[PDB]
Design an enzyme around this catalytic site. Structure first.
Site, PDB file in Angstrom:
ATOM      1  N   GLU A   1       0.827  -1.204   0.000  1.00  0.00           N
ATOM      2  CA  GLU A   1       0.000   0.000   0.000  1.00  0.00           C
ATOM      3  C   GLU A   1       0.868   1.263   0.000  1.00  0.00           C
ATOM      4  O   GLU A   1       0.857   2.062   0.938  1.00  0.00           O
ATOM      5  CB  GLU A   1      -0.966  -0.009   1.188  1.00  0.00           C
ATOM      6  CG  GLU A   1      -2.182  -0.897   0.984  1.00  0.00           C
ATOM      7  CD  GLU A   1      -3.183  -0.302   0.009  1.00  0.00           C
ATOM      8  OE1 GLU A   1      -3.235   0.936  -0.114  1.00  0.00           O
ATOM      9  OE2 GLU A   1      -3.917  -1.081  -0.637  1.00  0.00           O
ATOM     10  N   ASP A   2       1.624   1.426  -1.085  1.00  0.00           N
ATOM     11  CA  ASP A   2       2.449   2.612  -1.299  1.00  0.00           C
ATOM     12  C   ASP A   2       3.462   2.809  -0.177  1.00  0.00           C
ATOM     13  O   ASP A   2       3.785   3.943   0.186  1.00  0.00           O
ATOM     14  CB  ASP A   2       1.583   3.865  -1.452  1.00  0.00           C
ATOM     15  CG  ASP A   2       0.682   3.806  -2.668  1.00  0.00           C
ATOM     16  OD1 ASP A   2       1.094   3.217  -3.688  1.00  0.00           O
ATOM     17  OD2 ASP A   2      -0.440   4.352  -2.604  1.00  0.00           O
ATOM     18  N   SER A   3       3.969   1.719   0.389  1.00  0.00           N
ATOM     19  CA  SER A   3       5.031   1.776   1.381  1.00  0.00           C
ATOM     20  C   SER A   3       6.343   1.307   0.762  1.00  0.00           C
ATOM     21  O   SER A   3       6.377   0.727  -0.324  1.00  0.00           O
ATOM     22  CB  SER A   3       4.672   0.934   2.608  1.00  0.00           C
ATOM     23  OG  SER A   3       5.529   1.231   3.699  1.00  0.00           O
TER      24      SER A   3
ATOM     25  N   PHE B   1      -0.600   3.896   3.311  1.00  0.00           N
ATOM     26  CA  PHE B   1       0.696   4.186   3.923  1.00  0.00           C
ATOM     27  C   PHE B   1       1.569   5.015   2.979  1.00  0.00           C
ATOM     28  O   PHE B   1       2.676   4.628   2.611  1.00  0.00           O
ATOM     29  CB  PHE B   1       1.386   2.890   4.329  1.00  0.00           C
ATOM     30  CG  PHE B   1       0.492   1.943   5.078  1.00  0.00           C
ATOM     31  CD1 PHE B   1       0.036   2.260   6.348  1.00  0.00           C
ATOM     32  CD2 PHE B   1       0.106   0.739   4.515  1.00  0.00           C
ATOM     33  CE1 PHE B   1      -0.786   1.395   7.042  1.00  0.00           C
ATOM     34  CE2 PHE B   1      -0.718  -0.129   5.203  1.00  0.00           C
ATOM     35  CZ  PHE B   1      -1.165   0.198   6.469  1.00  0.00           C
TER      36      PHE B   1
ATOM     37  N   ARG C   1      -1.623   2.748 -11.219  1.00  0.00           N
ATOM     38  CA  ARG C   1      -1.154   4.088 -11.555  1.00  0.00           C
ATOM     39  C   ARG C   1      -0.729   4.184 -13.015  1.00  0.00           C
ATOM     40  O   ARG C   1      -0.725   5.282 -13.586  1.00  0.00           O
ATOM     41  CB  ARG C   1       0.003   4.490 -10.633  1.00  0.00           C
ATOM     42  CG  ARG C   1      -0.168   4.072  -9.172  1.00  0.00           C
ATOM     43  CD  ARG C   1      -1.129   4.970  -8.421  1.00  0.00           C
ATOM     44  NE  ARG C   1      -1.687   4.312  -7.245  1.00  0.00           N
ATOM     45  CZ  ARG C   1      -0.999   4.037  -6.142  1.00  0.00           C
ATOM     46  NH1 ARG C   1       0.286   4.367  -6.050  1.00  0.00           N
ATOM     47  NH2 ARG C   1      -1.595   3.434  -5.121  1.00  0.00           N
TER      48      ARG C   1
END
Ligand SMILES: [Mg+2]
Ligand SMILES: [Zn+2]
Ligand SMILES: [Zn+2]
Ligand SMILES: [Zn+2]
Ligand SMILES: [Zn+2]
Ligand SMILES: [Zn+2]
Lengths: 526, 192, 40, 48, 98, 98, 34, 64, 257, 44, 87, 115, 240
Positions: free
Chosen positions: A204-206, M159, A375
């Site tokens: 999650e975009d970490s 996150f 994206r």
């Protein structure tokens, strides 16, 4: 048009528009008209010739310049109104070459289509391969990316400044960066990024960062914070003076130690300062002398970098103190690629725990594969591949958006020439066990940026803290302990939950508890 | 926990290889796009020669726009389907889309075969200039390229006009995001 | 045909007003006109 | 509705005020339910 | 003397005009600094370009809500003088009135 | 003081007429990064008033080609209102028509 | 004449000359000077 | 600002090769050839020299 | 149910790297060996800095961080040297630390390169590896850097500056006989330098009964320790860790019974 | 209390009463000299 | 804590009667002096009447003998020589 | 501010046991060895050595949290074999293997240097 | 005037009475943590030490609370205040002498937040019940809140810089209320659409698809390693 192109009686910025259908000729000379230069095309041929190109090549030691092009009338400025009546050719080699006659009356030719982009959008590599809102997001992020904002940053004393220890020019760069001077003042570092789901801490975009790389200065920064304090002798007997006070001389003081200050009331450079520390000791004469000293941010813990004393524009003595705090990358720090891929550092693994290739190369950063599909930032993958090729070849890659000479297949062949999988994939070994990972990870150099958003500056807590005067409600005092707003939406959420006791706790007991004595007969209290 | 730890053995990555397609698939996509261009040109020729009969309940402009839009949408769908069929089992885009974790068939098609038509307010790119979408086209040009049909995939790279048209399209999405963020919060506060 | 939907339509429904954005009727036919295009 | 050959039962309107002034408050309840369900389910979403 | 005008840095009237990069370094000024801003009370202030409609041009618009079928407006401003702009409308009334 | 107050506060006009004075014209130069500084110096601001209400400027108009960056725009309430010049875009400074 | 193989170099030479002359903030400077 | 002592990825000593790299570039070596002569085989190490910007040289132009 | 009988074949041995092969060993043992090469091989590095004067353009802890990464010769000295935590002295002494002094003043017009050559240690055995030399900072005329540091024993598991390996290349089953990695298109992948396959063949035939063995190592040394010394120290340290674990386990078992 | 002139880099003693100004330079921006107190940095 | 704890089961709204206001007010005779302090100290009958509540944080009002936090503040009153409308 | 000291990853604080043994009531002849300030370096090697024992029915190890420094090793053996005995015997095998490796690596170094 | 004081979004009519700032609350960035249960929230040590819960002294917990008092505010875990039956508050750091720190039944020790404490964890905007859920505190060694990857969906959290608010209930009654009504496991199923609100997510979902494919075969060592991560395993290895 001839007069304007000869700069005889008409200046370059004057715009002449002929509305043929309306039988009108509008000549505009006022300011505020946005215009751009365009090459002139006559008889399906550029007026720009090899002689002009050679004179420009020898730009210096011959006095030839862009003004000479404009005077020669090879390139002229066109505004929007005149551009309505212009027949642009995107490129001369393709659109005005003898071919299927789409149009044989081209009037101007674009110098280069990429010049439609801005300063922040010009640093994106392969922006024509990214979904447009990601280009917008990167344009936003580039303004928050750390780097060296100006060469003479040591002399300057700004309220906030972030300086990356080891800024690097991108291995994959756009030709516009040469004019943005991004090479002189880079904002970011080239990092060995592997797009893999290693341990789930990059989900999650970490992002998972290499702890050994961080130890080696990877993405380390300075945070300079400047505090200005002025002493003003304004008032009949209300004067302020810089000096270290005493626990008894002043009307009131604090438990904070004032030993750091010097005889002049100023903290000397090179002294470590943490919370509840006095950097400037001021005293205001009571109409004794009340303590008017200033403190630091409790979270802030740095070293006094530079202390200067001078007279402001008002002639009053004032001191500027620059405190230096070193920010090493840690969990919660936000990093973003040049393609709108923004994410926090989920966890940091040592070089042992990080996966490694057959050559022992471990990725400095690991990003989740799921960040790419939705994206549609194919530019990020192309940048990674081109950066791998550039690092192996020793040549900075070119990622100018609208360049037909560069494409994925050519980059893949070049990579194959260097004993690597043509698609940038590598056989990675699990760091914990050393076993080959069944899937071959896509790993290569990509230019990442450390954004100014650090978890250190955002973390704050409140537990039985100060309250204001009238409302008796929480307010931040000497720290970031101002509490959190329990808004109407949260109230409705707790109502839906049915937690009446918890809602009452958060809205009365926690905010401003109070009790009053009230008469039973008449409701008004007394 | 269990599947995360098994992922340490199995591994997952995404890359350029998952975006590439077979040369035969590329040829099929290009042929489909060329046929779509020819079909749109034929429709434009009929409209110019007045041989286009408007459908009931619609004007001539609406009928022509509907025909062109259906042609281009069919081209996009066919190219996307061809790319999806060309994808192999090992394809990571396919793995994620099939599992439903992230992405979609439309995303795969845009990445691999064709981005597709760009629409502003539900219509093709408007004639912002005088009867032109951009100064690089002739006047009264209703072709797919003129009106904003991105025939290139994100992998291939969008051409200079198509990039601008895609930016125009995504600006609408950004505006919608801002409007929703500032709008959808107060309907609940009114109902409550 | 376009009909107001989504957030604005919900806003109208909760903000009932004499003039909706896209007032409209759904008319159904009960005779031979229902199954006959010409009589419809 | 009064027009001949027009189904007086199934025929309806999307205007809640018209439904109120013609058919009544209960008809308003039903039609409002239908319109709200239409807007919610248009995008495939479901609400109890 | 009638007052002081803030000076945009690196302009023709700034002290750092025509100075070589070495001179800027000696003055502790970054040669890469583009200037183009003002220093007011020590704060670097930049004037954001303000976008506005053009003047002296006749623009024929139509407002469905209003009672005018059409309206041609013209914002006339003096040639490099009298900054206040006077706007004139020439409208054609709607035919809705029966 | 008039020039200094206008440039400092940003309220473009007389300090007594701050009610009708345009705001946000002058902003503190952003020095977080060199790219940010350049973008701030090449920023444009769209108006908010009758013109904006009648025609929404929150859109990428075709005319922006080569004049305004199509990708650069803030996210949130300012989407499409704050713009940046294209790399080679130039704004006419004006001259006499004599 | 500039051939296609040389066009890429030529156009960027022209752009480099343009930016050498005008700079990236000559808008502000020219407006204030005027 | 100054050449890092260690390669960020693998930790190879890279801080003592900047002057030699510049000397080779002056001696007309291509960037890749100079890196090979310096012995930087891994592209992680080659990145250090290839993408380094020596801002300290200009920072020294300001009087202390 | 007993220990393996590993065998070692050293293919290359230089002053910078050692290349070898370990046969008849478990993949876990090999991975632990490399992980200890990087983690648990002690060396001597600067971990205490005291800057008296620093007029350079690099801030104090910048100089400290840069000094910490300078590799110091610790071939035979690391073994004798003790850990500062374990040593009984008052926070420092010759038996658990090495003192370094740097004092460089730039009085000439030419830029002065403060390199590791300017680091002077009271112990001749422990010195910077380069003594081109690692550049600490460039000084302008009138600028000075004066500091004193202590370098103490440590290993990479604490800070990367104590990691003695510039790169630990580790490989096994180069022909992918075990299929521990599945190539979607095996023909597209370059052969490993240890590959024993014909140019026409891309993958070795699948071996259902195969087990990971014959692990290839290439340990490159940053210079603090000889490449062979790194391997020997890693093996000794892993054995020591296991022995200490056994001692604690014996005590725990005795307590249980 | 030693102050360094910002222009000529001259050290000068200054009391709490006398004005802050270079003794010979006349320059009015002064910088405090680094503290004699020694601060320890871990080279991490 | 001698008194028991009670909850507000109802809230009656009504206009304060002048007689009830006069009797309730602790400022006997009303407020007639517009000076906060007579000579630098609180003065009875002034705006800053010490009866109405606590003045300084390290002080307690003379009515309920409560500190700043405990004292809820007590109302005063002003006698209008002429009746005045309420807006 | 919350960053832990690096040495905390391998140093035992006062009163901390390096290794503790807890019998597993779920299945007979099973033990859980919680080892503090240890990581995969020992976890994986010990687990692999244990798996070579035919009397060890189950052998596994896990780090409960990467930010913490404990490894839990679950060892289940046959009724006639104790998990503690299996652990000790596995350690005595790893130590012997490493000693043999050290001797043979020294011999290889000497051979390579000599010629 | 008084009318101005009352009216307004910032007035007492709607600004103060309806919404107010709150104590025993913290806010920071959220990061993933697959090793935490869906009902667990990781909390930084600094936040845990700053925030306290008043425990009533009982013979059951007299010794433990005395030990916490002895530790004091200096070293976490400890206590910040002692409240006698008189209701007076004593500051432990100001008073370190153990002579007067003796505890007895009826006192209240404001001990530092520790593992297992119930906290209401929220992400704004609060759109539905699942935006505010109960969590059990787990102290972790860095400055970010941790969240299980499944609970991101109900919170609509990511996150990539998102910040989340933590509130600490201060009494046993509110603690029971949260533990019995607002906990994450209870809120698995939402009444809005009678379907689970949180499910398996990106990495776990893709990896479980791959795992459940027909041709996935696990060797004995891999199977045991995976079984080590089953909290509910009965200890019996299934027949292959
Ligand atoms: Mg977010
Ligand atoms: Zn009463
Ligand atoms: Zn390297
Ligand atoms: Zn010692
Ligand atoms: Zn001087
Ligand atoms: Zn009172």
């Amino acid at each position: 048009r001839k007069l304007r192109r000869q700069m005889d009686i008409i200046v370059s910025e004057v715009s002449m528009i002929r509305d043929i259908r309306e039988r009108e000729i509008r000549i505009y000379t006022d300011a505020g008209r946005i215009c751009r230069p365009l090459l002139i095309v006559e008889k399906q041929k550029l007026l720009l010739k090899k002689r002009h190109i050679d004179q420009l090549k020898e730009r210096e030691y011959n006095n030839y310049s862009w003004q000479d092009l404009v005077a020669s009338g090879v390139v002229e400025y066109i505004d929007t109104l005149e551009e309505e009546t212009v027949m642009l050719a995107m490129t001369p080699d393709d659109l005005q070459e003898k071919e299927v006659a789409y149009c044989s009356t081209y009037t101007h030719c674009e110098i280069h289509p990429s010049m439609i982009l801005g300063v922040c959008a010009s640093i994106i590599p392969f922006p024509d391969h990214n979904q447009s809102p990601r280009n917008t997001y990167q344009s936003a992020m580039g303004k928050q990316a750390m780097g060296v904002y100006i060469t003479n940053f040591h002399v300057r004393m700004d309220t906030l400044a972030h300086v990356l220890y080891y800024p690097q020019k991108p291995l994959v760069t756009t030709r516009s960066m040469e004019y943005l001077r991004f090479r002189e003042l880079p904002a970011g570092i080239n990092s060995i990024v592997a797009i893999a789901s290693y341990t789930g801490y990059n989900q999650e975009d970490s992002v998972i960062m290499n702890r050994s790389a961080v130890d080696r200065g990877f993405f380390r920064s300075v945070f300079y914070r400047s505090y200005k304090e002025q002493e003003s002798k304004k008032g009949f007997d209300q004067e302020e003076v810089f000096e270290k006070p005493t626990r008894e001389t002043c009307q009131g003081m604090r438990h904070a130690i004032y030993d750091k200050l010097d005889d002049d009331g100023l903290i000397a450079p090179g002294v470590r300062v943490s919370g509840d520390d006095v950097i400037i000791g001021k005293t205001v004469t009571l109409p004794t002398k009340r303590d008017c000293s200033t403190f630091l941010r409790t979270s802030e813990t740095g070293i006094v970098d530079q202390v200067m004393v001078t007279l402001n524009q008002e002639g009053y003595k004032f001191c500027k103190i620059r405190v230096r705090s070193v920010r090493i990358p840690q969990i919660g720090d936000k990093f973003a690629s040049r393609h709108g891929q923004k994410g926090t550092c989920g966890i940091q693994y040592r070089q042992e725990d990080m996966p490694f290739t057959c050559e022992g190369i471990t990725p400095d950063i690991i990003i989740n594969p799921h960040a790419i599909p939705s994206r549609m930032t194919i530019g990020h993958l192309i940048e990674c591949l081109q950066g791998k090729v550039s690092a192996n070849k020793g040549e900075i890659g070119d990622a100018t958006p609208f360049n037909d000479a560069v494409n994925v297949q050519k980059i893949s062949n070049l990579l194959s020439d260097y004993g690597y999988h043509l698609r940038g994939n590598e056989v990675l070994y699990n760091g914990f066990t050393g076993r080959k990972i069944t899937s071959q990870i896509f790993i290569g150099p990509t230019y990442y940026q450390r954004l100014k958003h650090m978890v250190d500056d955002k973390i704050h807590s409140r537990a039985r803290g100060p309250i204001q005067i009238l409302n008796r409600q929480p307010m931040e005092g000497r720290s970031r302990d101002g509490g959190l707003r329990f808004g109407e939406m949260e109230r409705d959420c707790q109502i839906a939950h049915g937690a009446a006791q918890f809602l009452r706790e958060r809205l009365f007991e926690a905010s401003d508890p109070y009790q009053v004595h009230v008469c039973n007969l008449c409701g008004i209290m007394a | 926990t269990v599947i995360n730890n098994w992922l340490l053995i199995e591994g997952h990555t995404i890359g350029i290889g998952d975006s590439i397609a077979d040369s035969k698939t590329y040829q099929d996509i290009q042929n489909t796009i060329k046929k779509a261009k020819q079909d749109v040109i034929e429709v434009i020729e009929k409209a110019h020669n007045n041989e286009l009969e408007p459908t009931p309940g619609n004007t001539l402009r609406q009928t022509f726009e509907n025909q062109v839009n259906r042609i281009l949408n069919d081209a996009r769908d066919k190219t996307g389907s061809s790319a999806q069929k060309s994808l192999s089992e090992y394809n990571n885009f396919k793995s994620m889309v099939v599992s439903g974790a992230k992405g979609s068939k439309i995303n795969i098609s845009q990445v691999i075969a064709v981005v597709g038509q760009q629409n502003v307010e539900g219509k093709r790119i408007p004639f912002g200039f005088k009867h032109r979408t951009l100064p690089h086209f002739i006047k009264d040009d209703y072709g797919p390229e003129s009106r904003g049909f991105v025939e290139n995939s994100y992998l291939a790279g969008l051409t200079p006009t198509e990039f601008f048209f895609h930016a125009m399209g995504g600006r609408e999405g950004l505006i919608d995001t801002a409007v929703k963020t500032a709008e959808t919060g107060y309907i609940q506060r009114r109902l409550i | 045909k376009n009909v107001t939907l989504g957030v604005p339509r919900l806003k109208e429904l909760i903000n009932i007003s004499k003039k909706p954005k896209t007032p409209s009727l759904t008319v159904f036919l009960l005779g031979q006109s229902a199954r006959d295009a010409e009589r419809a | 509705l009064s027009e001949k050959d027009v189904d007086p039962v199934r025929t309806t309107s999307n205007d809640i005020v018209e439904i109120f002034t013609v058919l009544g408050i209960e008809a308003v309840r039903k039609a409002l339910e239908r319109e709200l369900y239409h807007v919610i389910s248009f995008d495939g979403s479901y609400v109890n | 003397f009638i007052g002081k005008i803030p000076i945009m840095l690196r302009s023709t009237y700034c002290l750092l005009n025509g100075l070589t990069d070495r001179d800027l370094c000696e003055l502790n000024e970054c040669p890469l600094d583009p200037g183009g801003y003002f220093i007011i009370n020590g704060s670097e202030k930049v004037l954001i370009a303000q976008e506005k409609m053009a003047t002296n041009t006749v623009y024929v618009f139509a407002k469905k809500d209003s009672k005018y079928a059409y309206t041609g407006e013209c914002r006339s401003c003096l040639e490099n003088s009298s900054r206040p702009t006077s706007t004139i409308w020439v409208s054609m009334l709607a035919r809705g009135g029966q | 003081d008039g020039l200094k107050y206008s440039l400092a506060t940003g309220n473009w006009g007389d300090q007594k007429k701050a009610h009708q004075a345009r705001a946000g014209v002058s902003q503190v130069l952003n020095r977080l990064t060199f790219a940010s500084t350049l973008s701030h110096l090449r920023r444009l601001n769209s108006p908010i008033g009758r013109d904006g209400k009648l025609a929404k400027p929150r859109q990428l108009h075709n005319t922006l080609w080569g004049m305004v960056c199509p990708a650069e725009t803030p996210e949130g309430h300012a989407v499409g209102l704050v713009k940046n010049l294209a790399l080679m875009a130039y704004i006419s400074v004006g001259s006499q028509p004599s | 004449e500039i051939t296609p193989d040389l066009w890429q170099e030529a156009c960027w030479i022209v752009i480099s000359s343009y930016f050498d002359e005008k700079g990236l903030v000559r808008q502000q400077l020219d407006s204030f000077d005027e | 600002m100054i050449i890092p002592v260690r390669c960020f990825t693998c930790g190879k000593i890279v801080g003592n090769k900047w002057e030699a790299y510049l000397g080779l570039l002056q001696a007309e070596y291509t960037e890749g050839d100079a890196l090979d002569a310096l012995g930087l085989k891994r592209y992680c190490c080659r990145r250090m020299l290839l993408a380094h910007v020596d801002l300290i040289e200009k920072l020294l132009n300001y009087a202390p | 149910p007993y220990a393996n009988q590993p065998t070692v074949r050293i293919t290359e041995l230089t002053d910078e790297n050692v290349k070898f092969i370990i046969e008849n060993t478990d993949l876990a043992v090999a991975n632990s060996i490399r992980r200890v090469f990087i983690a648990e091989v002690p060396i001597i590095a600067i971990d205490w800095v005291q800057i008296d004067a620093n007029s350079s353009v690099l801030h104090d802890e910048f100089i400290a961080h840069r000094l910490g990464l300078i590799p110091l010769t610790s071939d035979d000295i690391v073994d004798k040297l003790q850990y500062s935590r374990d040593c009984t002295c008052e926070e420092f002494c010759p038996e658990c630390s090495v003192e370094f002094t740097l004092d460089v003043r730039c009085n000439e017009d030419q830029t002065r390169h403060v390199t590791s050559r300017d680091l002077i240690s009271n112990s001749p055995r422990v010195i910077p590896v380069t003594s081109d030399d690692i550049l600490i900072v460039k000084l302008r005329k009138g600028q000075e850097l004066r500091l004193r540091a202590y370098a103490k024993k440590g290993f990479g598991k604490e800070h990367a500056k104590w990691n003695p390996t510039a790169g630990v290349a580790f490989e096994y089953d180069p022909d992918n006989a075990l299929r521990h990695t599945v190539y979607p298109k095996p023909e597209e992948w370059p052969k490993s330098e240890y590959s024993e396959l014909d140019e026409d063949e891309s993958q070795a035939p699948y071996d259902p009964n195969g087990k990971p063995e014959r692990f290839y190592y290439n340990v490159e040394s940053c210079g603090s320790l000889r490449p062979e010394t790194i391997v020997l120290s890693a093996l000794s340290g892993l054995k020591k860790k296991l022995s200490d674990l056994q001692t604690q386990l014996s005590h725990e078992i005795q307590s249980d019974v | 209390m030693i102050y360094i002139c910002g222009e000529c880099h001259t050290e000068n003693e200054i009391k709490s009463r006398d004005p802050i100004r270079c003794r010979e330079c006349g320059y009015r921006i002064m910088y405090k000299k680094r503290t004699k107190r020694l601060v320890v940095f871990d080279a991490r | 804590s001698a008194c028991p704890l009670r909850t507000i089961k109802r809230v009656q709204f009504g206009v304060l009667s002048p007689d009830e206001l006069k009797r309730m007010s602790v400022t006997e005779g009303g407020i007639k002096y517009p000076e906060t302090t007579e000579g630098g100290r609180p003065k009875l009958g002034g705006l800053m009447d010490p009866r109405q509540g606590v003045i300084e944080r390290t002080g307690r009002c003379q009515t309920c003998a409560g500190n700043m936090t405990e004292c809820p503040g007590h109302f005063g009153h002003i006698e209008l020589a002429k009746p005045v409308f309420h807006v | 501010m919350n960053a832990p000291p690096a040495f905390e990853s391998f140093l035992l604080f006062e009163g901390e046991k390096k290794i503790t043994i807890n019998k597993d009531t779920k299945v007979p002849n099973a033990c859980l060895f919680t080892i503090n300030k240890e990581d995969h370096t020992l976890g994986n090697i010990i687990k692999s050595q244990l798996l070579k024992d035919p009397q060890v029915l189950f052998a596994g190890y896990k780090v409960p949290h990467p930010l913490e420094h404990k490894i839990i090793i679950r060892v289940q053996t046959t009724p006639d074999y104790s998990p503690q005995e299996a652990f000790t015997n596995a350690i005595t095998d790893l130590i012997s293997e490493l000693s043999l490796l050290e001797e043979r690596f020294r011999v290889a170094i000497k051979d390579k240097q000599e010629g | 005037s008084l009318k101005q004081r009352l009216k307004g979004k910032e007035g007492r009519v709607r600004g103060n009475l309806m919404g107010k700032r709150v104590d025993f609350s913290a806010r920071t960035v959220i990061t993933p943590d697959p090793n935490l249960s869906i009902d667990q929230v990781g909390v930084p040590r600094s936040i845990a030490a700053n925030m306290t819960f008043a425990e009533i002294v009982t013979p059951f917990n007299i010794d433990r609370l005395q030990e916490l008092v002895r530790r004091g505010n200096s070293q976490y875990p400890g206590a910040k205040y002692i409240i006698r039956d008189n209701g007076d508050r004593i500051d432990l750091r100001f008073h370190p002498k153990p002579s007067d720190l003796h505890l007895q039944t009826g006192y209240k020790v404001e001990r530092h937040m520790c593992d297992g404490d119930i906290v209401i964890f929220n992400r704004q905007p609060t759109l539905h019940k699942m935006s505010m859920m109960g969590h059990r505190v787990r102290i972790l060694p860095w400055s970010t809140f941790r969240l299980n990857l499944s609970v991101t969906t109900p919170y609509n959290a990511d996150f990539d810089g998102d910040e989340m608010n933590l509130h600490l209930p201060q009494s046993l009654e509110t603690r029971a209320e949260i533990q019995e009504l607002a906990m994450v496991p209870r809120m698995i199923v939402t009444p809005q659409s009678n379907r689970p609100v949180m499910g398996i997510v990106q990495d776990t979902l893709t990896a479980v698809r791959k795992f459940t494919k027909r041709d996935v075969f696990l060797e004995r060592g891999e199977v045991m390693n995976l079984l080590m991560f089953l909290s509910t395993w009965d200890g019996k290895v299934p027949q292959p």
